[PDB]
């Protein structure tokens, strides 16, 4: 029992967590939801020799996101926490890694272009003065 001690009960329980990469518009929609209670549904389907992971956006949040699994054993990933009371703890170990991709193929680039217009807003260029200053 000390300030610098990290709680290691999560590692002793062998709790397995998932780390997933998502694109920025999904994060923006989740931030706009402001934790109402639900942002979407996570779907998993296992066949006789293959698996299929996807995420479906909430219909209210909108007004398909297939997932791709990847190799994990190249590194060992675990998650710890820091509290306001300075009580460090360990949540668990990452056992599976995935990434999120949009199902939109051609129209999605349009949104990318709009984000370009959202990202080219603060960059600023010189102007021409018709009249010299007075």
């Amino acid at each position: 029992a000390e300030r610098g001690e990290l709680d290691l009960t999560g590692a002793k329980q062998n709790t397995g967590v998932w780390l997933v990469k998502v694109p920025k518009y999904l994060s923006q929609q989740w931030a706009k939801a402001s934790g109402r209670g639900e942002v979407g549904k996570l779907r998993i389907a296992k066949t006789q020799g293959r698996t299929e992971v996807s995420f479906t956006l909430n219909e209210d949040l909108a007004n398909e996101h297939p997932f791709v699994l990847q190799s994990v054993g190249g590194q060992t990933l675990t998650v710890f926490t820091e509290s306001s009371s300075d009580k460090l703890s360990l949540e668990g170990i990452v056992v599976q890694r995935a990434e999120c991709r949009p199902a939109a193929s051609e129209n999605y680039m349009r949104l990318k272009r709009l984000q370009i217009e959202e990202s080219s807003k603060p960059v600023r260029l010189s102007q021409q003065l018709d009249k010299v200053v007075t």
């Binding site: 610098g4 990290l6 996570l42 990933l77």
Partner: protein, 138 residues
Amino acid sequence: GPSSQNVTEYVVRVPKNTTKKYNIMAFNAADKVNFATWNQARLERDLSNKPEDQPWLLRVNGKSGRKFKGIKKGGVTENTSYYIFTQCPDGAFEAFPVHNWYNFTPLARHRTLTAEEAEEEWERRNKVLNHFSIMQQR
């Protein structure tokens, strides 16, 4: 059986503001870390600078065990976001947004060569023979 066609649904949720911050730290693949020997641990801000913009120092089981140094991930979270999914008895996944990412490297505890005697050692730039006769004097 049921495991061949297991179809289950998990509710996801993200909190807005919370009391405790969340971070990610990683070990090396071949470091061979074991958490069962971590009877006592310490994680404190290093005094080599002399606070939040400083590296961490981690120590396991006091001076007897191994110790690590922690550095911040260089990639800024401007276009990147990482969340942690934890199992709960209620079942609703609670997405924890990341605050910072950390990385720890092992540091052994032994007799360590100092720079002042390394200045004397440097005369044996290429004349040095019997390399394991250096640490015997140390």
